[PDB]
C-alpha cells in the first residue's frame, strides 16, 4: 500500500493535487543552475597554477585560511555574467505561490533561489551563499552585500573590512567546515511535516546534505528530477526506484528544466509557469 497510485510523474502529479499532499520539501543542487549558465563548481573545468597541493584545496577551509587569494582569483574567473534563474527555480516559486512549499534546501551558493522569489524563511542554504559576506574578525562581523563583494573580486584586491581591515569572506561553507546550525534545526522540524520530497539537480554525493533523503517519513514519496539516477544504496557498502519492493520513489531522467516543465504541465500550471518565467527573464534582461 502506498500514497502514489503509480510510480510515475503522472502519479506524483495526481498525488500533489490530492488532499493528502500539503507540504513539499525541495532538495536542489548544481543541476538546477547549469542551464542558467552556471556550471557546477565541482566540475573539472574550473580546475585550470597557484602552487595548490591538490585540486580540492581551492575549496577546502584549511587552505583558504592564511591562503585566500587563489579562491578570490577563481571567484573572478567563474563569476557569472548574469544572474537569471531557471525554469526550475521559478517552479519552486510557483510551489510557494500555491501554498505547497514547506522548504527548499539548496546546495547552491549562486543566490538564484532568492532572485526567483524564495524568501529567507523558505530557504535553507546548506552550503551558505554569496548573497551576504562577513568580516572574519570575531569582534566585528560587519556584513556586506554581493554588490560590494563583486566589486572587490573584480578589482583583484582581497576584500578587506572597512571598519577593521580584516578579510571579508562570502557566507559560503567550505569543504571541511560545519554546516550552519540552521540546517540541522530546520531539518529536525521540517521532516516531521513533509508530504513530498522533490529532489532536483543533485547527485547526492556531498555530505551531510545527501543524507537528507533518509530523513523523510517512510510513506513520503520522493521524486528525483535529474540527468542521471542518484541516491540509490551503494552495493559496495536509499532510493528504490526499480525493484519489486519499490513503492514511493520516482526518477524522471533529463534536464531539470524539462522535468519541471513536464510536471507543471500535468498540474495544469504550464501557462502560469511560462508567463512567470518570461516576465522575470524579461525583467532581468532589462536591468
Amino acid at each position: 500500500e502506498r500514497l502514489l497510485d503509480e510510480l510515475t510523474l503522472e502519479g506524483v502529479a495526481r498525488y500533489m493535487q490530492s488532499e493528502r499532499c500539503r507540504r513539499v520539501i525541495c532538495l536542489v543542487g548544481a543541476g538546477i543552475s547549469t542551464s542558467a549558465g552556471i556550471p557546477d563548481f565541482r566540475s573539472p573545468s574550473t580546475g585550470l597554477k597557484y602552487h595548490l597541493p591538490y585540486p580540492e584545496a581551492i575549496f577546502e577551509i584549511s587552505y583558504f585560511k592564511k591562503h585566500p587569494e587563489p579562491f578570490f582569483a577563481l571567484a573572478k574567473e567563474l563569476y557569472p555574467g548574469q544572474f537569471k534563474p531557471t525554469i526550475c527555480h521559478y517552479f519552486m516559486r510557483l510551489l510557494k505561490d500555491k501554498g505547497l512549499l514547506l522548504r527548499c534546501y539548496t546546495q547552491n551558493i549562486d543566490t538564484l533561489e532568492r532572485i526567483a522569489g524564495l524568501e529567507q524563511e523558505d530557504l535553507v542554504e546548506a552550503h551558505g551563499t554569496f548573497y551576504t559576506s562577513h568580516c572574519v574578525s570575531a569582534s566585528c562581523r560587519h556584513e556586506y552585500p554581493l554588490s560590494w563583494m563583486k566589486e572587490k573580486i573584480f578589482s583583484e584586491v582581497t576584500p578587506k573590512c572597512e571598519n577593521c581591515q580584516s578579510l571579508v569572506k562570502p557566507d559560503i561553507v567550505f569543504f571541511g567546515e560545519s554546516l550552519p546550525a540552521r540546517f540541522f534545526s530546520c531539518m529536525q522540524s521540517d521532516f516531521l511535516k513533509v508530504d513530498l520530497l522533490l529532489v532536483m539537480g543533485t547527485s547526492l554525493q556531498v555530505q551531510p546534505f545527501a543524507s537528507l533523503i533518509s530523513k523523510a517519513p517512510l510513506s513520503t514519496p520522493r521524486l528525483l528530477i535529474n540527468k542521471e539516477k542518484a541516491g540509490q544504496s551503494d552495493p559496495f557498502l536509499g532510493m528504490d526506484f526499480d525493484s519489486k519492493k519499490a513503492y514511493r520513489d520516482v526518477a524522471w531522467l533529463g534536464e531539470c528544466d524539462q522535468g519541471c516543465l513536464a510536471l507543471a504541465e500535468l498540474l495544469g500550471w504550464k501557462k502560469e509557469l511560462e508567463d512567470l518565467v518570461r516576465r522575470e527573464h524579461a525583467s532581468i534582461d532589462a536591468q
Binding site: 580540492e56 552550503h127 561553507v173 567550505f174 569543504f175 571541511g176 567546515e177 560545519s178 554546516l179 554525493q205 556531498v206 555530505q207 551531510p208 546534505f209
Partner: peptide
Amino acid sequence: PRKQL
C-alpha cells in the same frame, strides 16, 4: 558533520 566529498 563537516561538509565532505
